[PDB]
Curated annotation (Swiss-Prot), chain A:
Annotated protein name in UniProt: E3 ubiquitin-protein ligase XIAP
Tissue: Expressed in colonic crypts (at protein level). Ubiquitous, except peripheral blood leukocytes.
Function: Multi-functional protein which regulates not only caspases and apoptosis, but also modulates inflammatory signaling and immunity, copper homeostasis, mitogenic kinase signaling, cell proliferation, as well as cell invasion and metastasis. Acts as a direct caspase inhibitor. Directly bind to the active site pocket of CASP3 and CASP7 and obstructs substrate entry. Inactivates CASP9 by keeping it in a monomeric, inactive state.
Gene label: XIAP
Residues in BIR repeats: 5-72
Amino acid sequence: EFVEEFNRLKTFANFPSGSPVSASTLARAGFLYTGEGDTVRCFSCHAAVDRWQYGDSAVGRHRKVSPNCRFINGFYL
Amino acid sequence: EEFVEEFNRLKTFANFPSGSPVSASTLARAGFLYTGEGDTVRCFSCHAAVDRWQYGDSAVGRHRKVSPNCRFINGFYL
Ligand SMILES: O=C(Nc1cccc(C(=O)Nc2ccc(S(=O)(=O)O)c3cc(S(=O)(=O)O)cc(S(=O)(=O)O)c23)c1)Nc1cccc(C(=O)Nc2ccc(S(=O)(=O)O)c3cc(S(=O)(=O)O)cc(S(=O)(=O)O)c23)c1
Ligand SMILES: [Zn+2]
Ligand SMILES: [Zn+2]
């Protein structure tokens, strides 16, 4: 369902174009856009991450908050 | 586990940045433990990791945003 990158990238309507991390990178890192600020939420682990700066790795920050996430550990590949 | 008591979460805040916009007691009261890196904290219940704290932040408000279904935040611990 949200296993498809493309469907996750559909949730990034109205995501801020100002953000230093693109919607594309985020969706590839397993995230959906919450529709509030730059807060994104993983479709698998349901954990969220916010406050993106220049140079963040979306995958890195995702591993940091949920090192045991199925997405991040390659369950869906 | 043992981190249900606020005082036990407060004990994990050794070496927390003195300059933090949000104090250790505010964070421990919001359910958080200090991971020992930067200003990164982690809820004992829902495992949400939060960092980059700024003036204006509510520790509980940010907690709820990242994990609206967190057991701790919804009073599951009496
Ligand atoms: O836990 C969560 N998430 C979580 C938790 C609580 C609430 C919410 C929440 O708010 N949910 C929702 C919000 C919004 C929406 S939405 O707005 O609707 O879109 C939701 C929609 C739906 S729906 O399905 O689409 O309807 C469903 C949910 S929901 O999640 O179902 O409710 C939603 C989310 N994820 C997770 C998953 C997998 C692995 C890990 C992981 O890595 N854990 C760990 C990390 C680090 C450490 S560390 O301390 O060692 O570093 C860990 C230590 C230990 S320890 O050694 O045992 O102490 C144990 C773990 S453990 O967890 O691995 O056991 C650790 C974490
Ligand atoms: Zn995840
Ligand atoms: Zn929590």
